[PDB]
Amino acid sequence: QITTGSKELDKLLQGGIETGSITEMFGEFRTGKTQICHTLAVTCQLPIDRGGGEGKAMYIDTEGTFRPERLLAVAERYGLSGSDVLDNVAYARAFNTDHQTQLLYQASAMMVESRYALLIVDSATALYRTDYSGRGELSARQMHLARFLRMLLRLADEFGVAVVITNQVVGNIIAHASTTRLYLRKGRGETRICKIYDSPCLPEAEAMFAINADGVGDAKD
Amino acid sequence: GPQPISRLEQCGINANDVKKLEEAGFHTVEAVAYAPKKELINIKGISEAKADKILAEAAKLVQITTGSKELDKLLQGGIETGSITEMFGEFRTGKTQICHTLAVTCQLPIDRGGGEGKAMYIDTEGTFRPERLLAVAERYGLSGSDVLDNVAYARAFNTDHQTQLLYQASAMMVESRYALLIVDSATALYRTDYSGRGELSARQMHLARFLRMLLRLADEFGVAVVITNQVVGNIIAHASTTRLYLRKGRGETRICKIYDSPCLPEAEAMFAINADGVGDAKD
Amino acid sequence: GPQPISRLEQCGINANDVKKLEEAGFHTVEAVAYAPKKELINIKGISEAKADKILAEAAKLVQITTGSKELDKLLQGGIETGSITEMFGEFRTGKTQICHTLAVTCQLPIDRGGGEGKAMYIDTEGTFRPERLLAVAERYGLSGSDVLDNVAYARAFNTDHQTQLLYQASAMMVESRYALLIVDSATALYRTDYSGRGELSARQMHLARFLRMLLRLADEFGVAVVITNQVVGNIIAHASTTRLYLRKGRGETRICKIYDSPCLPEAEAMFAINADGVGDAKD
Known about the structure:
This is part of a larger assembly, with three copies of chain A. By secondary structure, chain A is α/β, with parallel strands linked by helices. The first copy, chain A, contains eight helices and nine strands. The first copy, chain A, has a nine-stranded mixed β-sheet with strand order 3-2-4-5-1-6-7-8-9. Chain A: This is DNA repair protein RAD51 homolog 1. Chain A: Residues 84-157 are annotated as: Interaction with PALB2.
């Protein structure tokens, strides 16, 4: 279980994300999905005794929000070398759905040579909306997404890594595929409310957390 | 860096299709390469075979001071060059005034908060005033005549002309150093031209391509990309790096708020609109 | 005792209708016998004539320690085998932890507060942890491997699958001695599967039949039936013999209250959730 670095969120997840499975966090824009991704991209490298997975991170970006400086901030939070964190995070921005799926072929072979623990896909559903914008092409994006999800599950079961995908809520296929569904909503100021809205293993429950410069971290009124 | 699309023609794409790609707004091999088939297919007079030949051969080759101190502090010193900064607010909030101010401040020395580069103003709303540029130049002690000589201006009558001006901007921005590109009422032409509901996807695609071209030009020339949005879309969020919400305080004093930045905090700063300048609030 | 439904087929009910009754969850001649017509008619692929033939021919034939001492005293020594005990409480109160503890304590000698029987864990919520069983086994000095060998586990994917698992449970519970049947988040699948409002009566009927099957299995094998309900139906009241209300005390220490029992008083006891065990609070 990779620590979220929020204790309340860790309790919400029963200790953190299960490696080897896909965890979906669906919420509005600005809820902190990207911030959580950046935090986890570093916390995954933490020792297992510290709530990490002791593995490298993979950031596949589709939305431009990737900030190595945020990774450096998370590394300094946990007292990790920011340079080694960036050395253990391979980054590439996916411009479309075809490139998004094509990166998985390179990811599977690259993930064999080095130990990774976390795969992040940020705005994972955005490219299926920007690329496939028509209505007659809906089945095409659904087929591509289905294949993409199957490849994700295959990589999760193959390498025992955590699969994190982000969904903007302005598909029902992901429900069976995603193991933990988290609904994120804004609390005013910088403090965000997290709710579990489906999980076959985790209870429906809520936890309050904040987004701090160092970290995704518990709310401290 | 960039790989201008001219090199794609040596791969054996015919030059007429490359001209169609440049009209579409693709100017580099990087630009054509990392896009799916449908982008090139949607262009008039391009089949799936030509799009596959293009993608295949393409894979073979590949801080400006706001002049308000409080606003500069809000931005941590000013706009980051090389990225798109969106200021969304109601009408009469001073968006155009801020644009006019930045059009001159960009030319300021870097030690004075400028970019030491020329400005580009693409207007769609008629609000372009060379006299405001002259006022900002005299504020900072810049030659008003040289400011107008270092600002190239053109009014876009429609969305197609709005995108077409980027083709002249990319080639013209190579010969001279620019630091600021201004697109005023950038979203107005997508509302006045495309007013129907069945044509919404077309204007959304054109806007998406326009924003991608803006980011491409920003990374290519290291210039600041400024676009103005009237708030009487979620697509701009991933594309815009810094979102500023502008609201009126009564009289001439305006409230600025940061509503998204991965690096800059969400925060607010109070400023005023003065004859010389966009300038700090002075109660 | 029971009168397994196999004998009903010799009365001349066809075997396919008996299989449909077993899928529905009727496994004894007692089970077919004491039900009205509508139960059998509501089953898919069963007409009124077949239901009347079934009822007519059917009429011819017809304390496990909690490991918290305070909780054992609250229950007068532990769960009564052969009856349904419902623990309703908020999430994170420790229902699952208590289930994991009992899954091992049931195997304890009767003189030690056990039932000297194997355990059955039917999970609907994913919270099954063999490592928790190992911790409880080492707490009471039981072989963790033998505990897992004496606990048969199966995860129910839906309400129909949840009821279908009882058919395998009834036949499997005949070959080996069991003492405890655990159904964790027993009501969760009735909320996730049947989420609409017009289908409420359908989930209520399915739940009623499932509960009747639980009571039948309890009377049949003399095992304790433990089901967990999350309180973020009034039908369970008559069916459950002992109602326990669970609420969180801050930290890891939980308050237990008895909120209905015809024999046990309404009373409260304080306990904690410890790595080894569900175990008394020790300030």
